[PDB]
Amino acid sequence: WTRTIKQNNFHVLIDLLNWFRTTNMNVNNCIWALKSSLNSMTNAKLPNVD
């Protein structure tokens, strides 16, 4: 199996797919950042006067 790889770039393969996991997680991280910004707004209003 080690003879199958010619350029010995299997670490490049592994780093590429870990980078792919990071990039596939960045969009959901942005969504959760917007959700945290949403949850920050719950206390920050001023209700109707009584």
Partner: protein, 56 residues
């Protein structure tokens, strides 16, 4: 309070533009999203604080 009402309109338009820019940044490179989320965060707290100033 007309200055505050026009500022509220400007803040709403800026929020919509900042969302569009956030979608563009996510569509080309979702690694500088932090500053755009921060800008949406400060635009929104400015909108809410202007509403709280108008509340009395």
């Amino acid at each position: 309070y007309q200055y505050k009402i026009q500022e509220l309109r400007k803040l709403l338009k800026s929020l919509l533009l900042n969302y569009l820019e956030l979608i563009g940044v996510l569509s080309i490179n979702p690694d500088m999203y932090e500053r755009k989320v921060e800008n949406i965060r400060t635009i929104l707290v400015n909108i809410h604080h202007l509403l709280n100033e108008y509340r009395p």
